[PDB]
Design a protein around this ligand. Structure first.
Ligand SMILES: O=C(Cn1nnnc1COc1ccccc1Cl)NNC(=O)Nc1ccc(Cl)cc1
Length: 314
């Protein structure tokens, strides 16, 4: 006893066992099935016409026969459209949130072990989407998320941008191990829907290691949730940022330098002498979520050059 969903692009079908799994108090595989069908009907208007009107209205999630009739009415509609077609784009924001939730639900089987990953789609997703729209990224950029956890920020950026590569680095054992499954599941679900993503790597490691010193120096876009970082972690990170190229950017949860930094003879060693800092917020740019702010730092050594020029030409 199981339920099968045919891929809109001919990939291997989605197979769910019966009884259907329960993910948490606010997610179960039954609603995942219904929402997957609905998203595929939105991205394929012909499928909407083939699909009978009543099917996605009159349903019982606690009835095998009911859930099978629903799955079959979608599969028969996929088959009809696939026949009509006889005679890979980026996902929409809406579809991506659903894909990430799907990937998470299938990857983190014991959620007890872990703004937590559970609520990523309900809080963090929209802020990250807002960050992707603000920090414009090209095919020349290299993206790194320092302390990537289960890897959802990396998967979101990689599905939205055209960076050469996207990296996620996590030191902790439990999230780094879950990231391995998230990676496999993300690639599997993206192929299922027939969606394109940029290249990405989720790896285990310490971003303060010698290996990561040259790697940070060659990154053009760093995303770092530094809210909980200690003084030594913060001080070492600033040391790594100081080797970055002009125009290199760091997007963080707490600024690394004062927003009002004014260079003088007593603060010449501060990171503020080689970077610009701006507070950005979805409330500044029609937002209705949390009143949050993120901080954009841009490597600019002219701050330091101008100070010296002013001393020589007063
Ligand atoms: O584990 C992860 C992402 N993650 N994956 N699954 N769940 C989560 C929890 O997310 C969050 C937790 C707290 C705050 C925000 C998020 Cl998004 N690390 N990466 C990461 O926080 N990036 C990041 C976030 C904000 C800025 Cl300003 C700069 C970088």
């Amino acid at each position: 006893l199981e339920l099968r969903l045919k891929s809109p692009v001919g990939a291997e079908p989605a197979v769910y066992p019966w009884p259907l799994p329960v993910y948490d108090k606010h997610h179960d595989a039954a609603h995942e099935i219904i929402e997957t069908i609905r998203w595929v009907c939105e991205e394929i208007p012909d499928l909407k016409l083939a699909m009978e009107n009543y099917v996605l209205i009159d349903y019982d999630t606690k009835s095998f026969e009911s859930m099978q009739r629903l799955c079959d009415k979608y599969n028969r509609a996929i088959d009809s459209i696939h026949q009509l077609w006889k005679g890979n784009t980026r996902p929409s924001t809406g579809l991506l949130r659903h894909i990430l939730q799907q990937v998470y639900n299938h990857s983190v089987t014991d959620p007890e072990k872990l703004f937590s990953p559970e609520v990523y789609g309900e809080t963090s997703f929209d802020l990250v989407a807002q960050m992707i729209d603000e920090i414009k990224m090209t095919d020349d950029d290299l993206f790194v998320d320092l302390g990537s956890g289960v890897g959802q920020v990396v998967l979101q950026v990689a599905a939205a941008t055209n960076c050469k590569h996207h990296y996620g680095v996590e030191k902790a054992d439990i999230p780094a191990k879950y990231a391995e499954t998230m990676d496999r599941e993300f690639r599997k679900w993206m192929k299922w829907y027939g969606k394109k993503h940029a290249e990405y790597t989720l790896e285990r490691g310490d971003f303060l290691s010698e290996e990561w010193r040259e790697r940070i120096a060659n990154t053009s876009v760093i995303f770092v949730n530094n809210f909980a970082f200690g003084p030594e972690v913060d001080h070492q990170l600033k040391e790594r940022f100081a080797n970055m190229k002009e125009g290199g950017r760091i997007v963080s949860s707490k600024p690394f330098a004062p927003l009002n930094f004014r260079i003088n003879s007593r603060n010449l060693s501060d990171i503020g002498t080689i970077m610009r800092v701006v507070e950005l917020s979805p409330l500044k740019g029609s937002w209705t979520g949390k009143p949050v702010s993120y901080y954009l730092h841009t490597i600019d050594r002219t701050i330091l050059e101008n100070y010296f020029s002013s001393l020589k030409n007063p």
